[PDB]
Structure 1
Amino acid sequence: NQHGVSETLVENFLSRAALVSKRSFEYKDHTSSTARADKNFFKWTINTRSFVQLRRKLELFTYLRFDAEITILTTVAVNNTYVGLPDLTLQAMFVPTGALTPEKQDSFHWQSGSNASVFFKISDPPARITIPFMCINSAYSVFYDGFAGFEKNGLYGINPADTIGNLCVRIVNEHQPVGFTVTVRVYMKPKHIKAWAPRPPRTLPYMSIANANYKGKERAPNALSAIIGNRDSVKTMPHNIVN
């Protein structure tokens, strides 16, 4: 067979640097902003669940063993008048699952005595770090039919061993007299993928990231009662060649 089957390899199928996180957070004097607003930093619990293209590709399989390759594309915009875009230095400190995430921009958790920080700039090429296979199990449970805790209050489907960690990203510079809208796009490319137990591709749209809930479109296609869009009868050809 002359036709190559090398693009359907899971090492080629899943190793696409897809978007996994995106926050446009402000960058200004955070002396009047609320507690919900990002005071020049953001924590992100690293998951593949937030964006549905990489999620459905990784929800094709039950168990995955990949090395994440976190590429952090930081881009900047200005909130009347316009001035030049600054060359902001950013720190992307890698915090494990459930460890101490920092409370401030200038807190003393960003010193990174042991946490893997990467210091990059906006003007530089995007910072790329290889997060290794960081599960206590031999594979990432993409679907975890079960509970985390020993008590009956645990979250269904969320194994914290499946969670990579936290990607705490701040801007190393101080506040500046004008505000900037600094958007941090994180791109994860799973690599050295070993994929086990394939699953049905999800047809219905996603509702949340914590679970596999489903509502479907109101009408076909991809509805609950009708995944494939409807035709007239079973003996009616939709795209018929009528000359």
Structure 2
Amino acid sequence: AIQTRAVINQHGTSETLVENFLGRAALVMMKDFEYKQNFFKWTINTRSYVQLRRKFELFTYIRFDSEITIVPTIRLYTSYSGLPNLTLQAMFVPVGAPTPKSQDSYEWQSACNPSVFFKIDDPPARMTIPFMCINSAYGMFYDGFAGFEKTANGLYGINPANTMGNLCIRVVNAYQPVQYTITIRIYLKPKHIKAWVPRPPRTMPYMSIANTNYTGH
């Protein structure tokens, strides 16, 4: 209710660079799983949260490299004996490879899927995912269909080339006597960001994750 005014002195424009605008490491996913689904699985995408989705949708094509940081926290259940230093495996599955179906699955040993073995009591794991798209840039808006046949006409705006891959995290020494609950936080920091064809910002609230429908308010 106080109408205060201050003299503003500014100089320089490096702060408003698109590299700095989109180069902020933000939460992209956060999931909790129990001792025994039994593991963490999530396909990498930006549209999970409204803020980052709106930030990215201001442009039509963005090409960037992805830096992923995994911050695990462990909370015990029910006597107490301390927080175990469980080993964690985080594996990136590209778009052309199968994903595991269980904790003791065969794809955990694949030599073509990058894997990071890190412990709870260590600094968070970190790896960089290069630009891994068929096209030269990601497309946030697709005015087209995947194919010429049915069961694809129901997927409008979905381009298979726009998928970023699957990230799977498990606990190698999962079986423990008592219990534990593990929370995984994924931080994504785009790097070498380049963007094209800016678009009007989104105004109406989102109605779905992959269909740009809109409602009132």
Tell me the C-alpha RMSD between the 2 structures. Answer: 1.6
Point out where structure 1 has 5 or more consecutive residues left out of the alignment.
Answer: 31-37, 217-222, 224-243
Aligned AA (2:81): V
Q: Specify the alignment match of 1:194 in structure 2.
A: 194
Deviation at 1:72, TM superposition (A): 1.1
Aligned AA (1:171): V
Does 2:11 match 1:3?
A: yes
Map 1:111-190 → 2, pairs under 5 A = 111-154=109-152, 155-190=155-190
CA distance in 2, matches of 1:141, 1:132: 16
Q: Which residue of 58, 64, 67 corresponds with 2:65? A: 67
CA distance in 2, matches of 1:188, 1:53: 14
- Aligned residue for 1:57, secondary structure, equals helix
The structure with the largest strand share of the pair is 2
TM-score under structure 1 length normalisation: 0.80
CA distance in 2, matches of 1:152, 1:8: 45
Runs of 4+ in 1 over 6 A off after TM superposition: none
Deviation at 1:173, TM superposition (A): 1.1
Q: Specify the alignment match of 1:54 in structure 2.
A: 52
Point out where structure 2 has 5 or more consecutive residues left out of the alignment.
Answer: 1-8
**Does the 8 A contact of 1:97 with 1:160 survive in 2?**
no
Deviation at 1:2, TM superposition (A): 6.6
CA distance in 1, matches of 2:173, 2:208: 35
Q: Which residue of 21, 26, 29 corresponds with 1:18? A: 26
CA distance in 2, matches of 1:6, 1:118: 35
CA distance in 2, matches of 1:146, 1:82: 56
- Aligned residue for 1:204, secondary structure, equals coil
Q: Specify the alignment match of 1:232 in structure 2.
A: none
CA distance in 2, matches of 1:145, 1:74: 38
Aligned AA (1:118): V
Deviation at 1:214, TM superposition (A): 1.8
- Aligned residue for 1:135, secondary structure, equals coil
- Aligned residue for 1:110, secondary structure, equals helix
CA distance in 2, matches of 1:112, 1:9: 40
Quick one: percent identity of the two aligned structures? 73
The structure with the largest helix share of the pair is 2
CA distance in 1, matches of 2:25, 2:32: 20
Larger Rg, first or second structure (1 or 2): 1
TM-score under structure 2 length normalisation: 0.90
